[PDB]
Amino acid sequence: AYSLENLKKISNSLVGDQLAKVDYFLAPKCQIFQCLLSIEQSDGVELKNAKLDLLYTLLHLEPQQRDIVGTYYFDIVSAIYKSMSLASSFTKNNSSTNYKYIKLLNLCAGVYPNCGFPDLQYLQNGFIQLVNHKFLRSKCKIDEVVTIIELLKLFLLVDEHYQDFKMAESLEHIIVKISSKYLDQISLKYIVRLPFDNKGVDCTRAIPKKINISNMYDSSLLSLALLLYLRYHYMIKLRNDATFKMFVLGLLKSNDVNIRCVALKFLLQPYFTEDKKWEDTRTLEKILPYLVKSFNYDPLPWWFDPFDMLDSLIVLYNEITPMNNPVLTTLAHTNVIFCILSRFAQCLSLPQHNEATLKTTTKFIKICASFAASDEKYRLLLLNDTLLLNHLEYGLESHITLIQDFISLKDEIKMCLPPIYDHDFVAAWLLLLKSFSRSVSALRTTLKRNKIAQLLLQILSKTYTLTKECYFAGQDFMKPEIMIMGITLGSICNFVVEFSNL
Amino acid sequence: ISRIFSQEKQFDNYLNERFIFMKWKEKFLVPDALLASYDGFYYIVHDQVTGNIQGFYYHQDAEKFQQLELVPSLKNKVESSDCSFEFA
Amino acid sequence: DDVDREFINCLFPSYLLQQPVAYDLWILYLQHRKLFHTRKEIWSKLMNLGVLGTIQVYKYFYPDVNDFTLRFGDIYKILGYFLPSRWQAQPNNSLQLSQDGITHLQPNVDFAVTWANKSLPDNKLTIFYYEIKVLSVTESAENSNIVIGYKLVESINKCQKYGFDLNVFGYCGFDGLITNSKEYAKPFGRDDVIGCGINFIDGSIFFTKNGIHLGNAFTDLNDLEFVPYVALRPGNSIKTNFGLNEDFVFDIIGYQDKWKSLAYEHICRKFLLGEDNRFIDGKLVRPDVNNINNLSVDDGSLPNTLNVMINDYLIHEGLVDVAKGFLKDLQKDAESKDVIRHNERQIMKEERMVKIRCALENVISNTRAMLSTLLEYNAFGSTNSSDPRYYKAINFDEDVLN
Amino acid sequence: FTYGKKCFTKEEWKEQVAKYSAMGELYAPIEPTLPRLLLNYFVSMAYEDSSIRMAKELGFIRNNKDIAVFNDLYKIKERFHIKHLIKLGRINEAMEEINSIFGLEVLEEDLHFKLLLLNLIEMIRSHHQQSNDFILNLIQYSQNKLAIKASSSVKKMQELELAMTLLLFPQNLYSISLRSKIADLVNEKLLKFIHPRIQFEISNNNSKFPDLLNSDKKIITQNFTVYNNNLVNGSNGTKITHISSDQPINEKMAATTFHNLENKNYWNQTSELLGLEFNNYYSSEFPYEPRLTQIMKLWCWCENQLHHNQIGVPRVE
């Protein structure tokens, strides 16, 4: 029997210290978990809030402590996804219980993102009704607004027909409702070279002044809603309006990092999806300095990666027009490519490495292989360094030794198994090898080494015998291997042309 | 000097013109690169209709105006078959 | 009212209005205020007087908010402007300039050199910036015979023959290399916006290319006077933007905000003053100490002095009940006892004076006065003449009081 | 010794002061913004009676219900209670009301270590001033409550070691001003935490009360951002650095799923590993202090900078 005062005292005694909740997990006093998980519909709202608060406090554990505890933590998380039925009664509960429930769901999805969530549709329906009835009619309290923000955060974490249309309509309504208050701060004084009209705005490199959203909840709601709208709206307007385009262009210079990042994601989406959009190079020249500045911010969101977007733009222009790349020419004149190559040479020379340094080096190798995919200038400039090919051979040799060591111990191990930790590293190195091998002078002078060819053949044979023998490791262990086979065969089919020496 | 460049600025597509002007430069040795009398370069004119190549060889510390005058090599079979390759 | 604000933002550059030079621009606008005296009407009036028309039309962007919610859901000569606004026409008639002097500039082989309308005072502003745009090229496409930058004001034939002299701090377009050099940048060609700026806090000259900041070229250039300067060979032309007509490309406002935030971080992160103790024989004498003011938050002397001043201001304004409440709150919170006794004596004296029948505003006014006195006398940073001068980054009335 | 650059007498200094006072009055010898600054100072320092009387005199408070609504909005009584309990030495009760009234999000997400350390110093001083079991309990509390927090940071371990070294005996740590400093930091953090609710209740509910922290003209950000220039930009030159190591990298080492956020901040950690220190202190951390203290900081700094540069000015009397 646990009352409100007992749960309040337990909650007060567990703040800060992480050893006491580990003790609560380990001890046979864990019967409270049953009381923590039997959320009856007849229970009091204060009791429900105390139970949800204690559930949130107990699961807020450091990774070392959750490694000490073990499988019981994940058992509690899975039972939270399976036992409590607050999602079915989303419209029936009050706003505080809903807010604490979505906060607990956010924590559970953050700690255990593998197991399935079987009640997303009820949450989507509750979100649609909540924004259609209360928020859009200016009849919302504080807790409902924070619940909408938490639901937007939870919906952004989903990996992934009528409900999609309803969600798109609701998000467009949220964007139009919020952005219409700050739409009067757009001001640009320009010159057309041939007065209150808006003809010829897309002929200058200037963008309107900085637009600042003073309200913090409005800025958070606008950012999250516009990101989900970017996820949704092509399946089902706002992109083609000139006023909204100027509004986002003015939002590019804001103070909030999330606003700048979501503006960069909004403006650069039609280049990859729309047809004949890549001819608009003036918008690209207007956008690119702010992406370069977005490389330089210390707190960055998890949904924004400047390396991926720059690489995607360069690969797009390499695939469409191989002879002319606007991004490379506008980055070479403004001293950015030399900085990128210098940072790559600095990352390859760090005395101490971890997983983060490997990921940074992998992104640098990918962008450097994207530089030299269709230009001989950057190919020869990269091959001017005499220590790059040594590191390429070192990476290939490391992967071969790792694969051979895993093959040699297949009987002892024998089912989900994690992949080999440097599959992306080797894939990026093979991308550089292919881009270097795409030129005849390098095939006849610089890539003359037999070690590269024998390493490629060894990688192919070892990966094929992995797929033949150790198939019990699962698909997550084998998909990077088959990708490596494809890239190695591409490099090989480049080296086997008749007028190459190998 | 400026006049010829100004007149050059209004020319049409160069692939639709009968004559193609270009420059040739020898890079290295073909059988084994490691195992230099090619410091100059060739001014080359190529005629597409008859497909023949004329040109001059220029180097500062050498003799001037050495001619080339190439012609296509006739084969021993009028029927021709086509092979192909593509860099990946 | 808002009409004066709309006019002064429509007349002067925006980044200049967020510096301590904005007082002079406000005075200049208010002196000639009879000429001028919902923003569409103000812009139309300014165009009728003429700020938005030339010959290339000076367009303006006006959004449509109601439609968006429906479908979805020379005057500068008259005023007295003292900053550069146009190029100066050379008396030898070697240049072709437009009527406004900024829209076109073409030489009529030796360089044709010219400078700007006015010079830049050292002790008046924080950051200056202006841009040029290459319109035509007479070699390669990305190679122009233009030298653009600043010139020291105290050789002209040397500038015409070579392009620059020992007093020119600038950027050359024919080789992408600064004047008195080094690997700094690359040459610029046709349709390239090249910006030049000077920073008076640390005293450095920087250049920008197509909105990208290219770094500091020259350093340690304080206590000096500069003029914008350009040199062009015949065949190529530029369009100049000083900020009065159109909007910049760079985002110089973010640069200024970063420097202002750095200055604010550096600065902001007994209990009776009495008479001035350094008056002897009617003159000020320098004490042989390191500082004259020794108040700090960490010792509690600054909150005590602030509380004494607040109590004196509240009593002086006829707010004795509020002072009593403040004294009661200070008693509830608890050399603070001496402050409590002094405040209690002050309310007792005020009650006695009321039964028989400031210092804060001085602090504010003196803070503004010493900020301006620091600005106009070219004070050193901390010890050396190379440290940054942070007092140039403070607009006291627009960033602290409001 | 005398001032070399300039030596102002009373008359010309008064002339300059009058000129800039006229300029400030036209922007705004009286300052129209001083009562608002006084109200901000009274509310932000958690004073009950003076803030209510100042708001009544300025024309906001008219009923007792308005007094209750104002004290609910700015949480003056609760913050004053927390500050009083921190200064007195009832630390556990202070986190009790912090977790009870303000939620647990305030403590779960830098002052927790400070509060725990101040509780440890208070307990040690109470044990010394007024034997094996108590010392064992104190050692267990020190080694259990703050083990991870002290082991996480080098300065944390240094502070814990200094406190432990000072414990085994019979000035700043023993000073009473540390409690007031921690109370002021807690108050500033609490105001920063509850500012968005105040913004929402002023804007959406159309309350007649003002926003004393931030005016509508200026900008403000909820987060703190450090801008690291000279990392990826064009301000480095047209030269290329070469690799200076020939040692291999590996030697120096119906269900709905969710994204994996493991190792998503790799670039920040790497760039930390890979006229300076630009950030947004003005728009994130500046407006959450009493403004009059900032004005006296500026006044003292300007006075010392004028005295340094051989310029003599009369002082305020």
Residue numbers in the entry:
A (entry chain 5): 4 to 163, 186 to 219, 234 to 275, 280 to 457, 466 to 553
B (entry chain 4): 269 to 303, 310 to 362
C (entry chain 1): 16 to 52, 80 to 97, 109 to 126, 326 to 360, 393 to 422, 425 to 440, 496 to 522, 527 to 614, ...
D (entry chain 8): 27 to 54, 84 to 164, 192 to 212, 219 to 258, 275 to 357, 383 to 403, 412 to 454
Publication passage describing the model:
To gain insights into potential functions of Gid12, we obtained cryo-EM reconstructions for Gid12 bound to the substrate-receptor and scaffolding (SRS) module (a Gid12-Gid4-Gid5-Gid1-Gid8 complex, referred to as Gid12-SRS), to GIDSR4 (referred to as Gid12-GIDSR4), and to Chelator-GIDSR4 (referred to as Gid12-Chelator-GIDSR4) at 3.3, 9.8, and 19.4 Å resolution, respectively. Thus, we built coordinates for Gid12-SRS, and generated atomic models of Gid12-GIDSR4 and Gid12-Chelator-GIDSR4 by docking them with Gid12-SRS and the respective prior structures of GIDSR4 and Chelator-GIDSR4. In agreement with the biochemical data, Gid12 primarily contacts Gid4, and also Gid5. Gid12 emanates from and extends this groove, to wrap ≈305° around Gid4. Three insertions (Ins4, Ins4-5 and Ins5-6) form helical structures that pack either against the sides of the propeller or between blades, while an insertion in the third blade of Gid12 (Ins3) forms a meandering loop that plugs the central pore on the bottom face of the propeller. The Gid12-Gid5 interaction primarily involves the edges of blades 1 and 7 on the side of the Gid12 propeller binding a ≈ 30-residue Gid5 region that was disordered in prior structures and is presumably stabilized in the complex. Gid12 interacts across a diagonal around all eight strands in the Gid4 β-barrel, from the N-terminal tip of strand 4 at one edge of the cylinder, nearly the entire length of strands 1 and 8 at the center of the interaction, to the N-terminal tip of strand 5 at the other edge of the cylinder. Gid12 extracts Gid4’s L2-loop, such that Leu172 and surrounding residues faces outside the central cylinder, and bind a pocket at the junction between Gid12’s blades 7 and 1.
In yeast, the evolutionarily conserved GID E3 ligase mediates glucose-induced degradation of fructose-1,6-bisphosphatase (Fbp1), malate dehydrogenase (Mdh2), and other gluconeogenic enzymes. “GID” is a collection of E3 ligase complexes; a core scaffold, RING-type catalytic core, and a supramolecular assembly module together with interchangeable substrate receptors select targets for ubiquitylation. Here, we structurally and biochemically characterize Gid12 as a modulator of the GID E3 ligase complex.
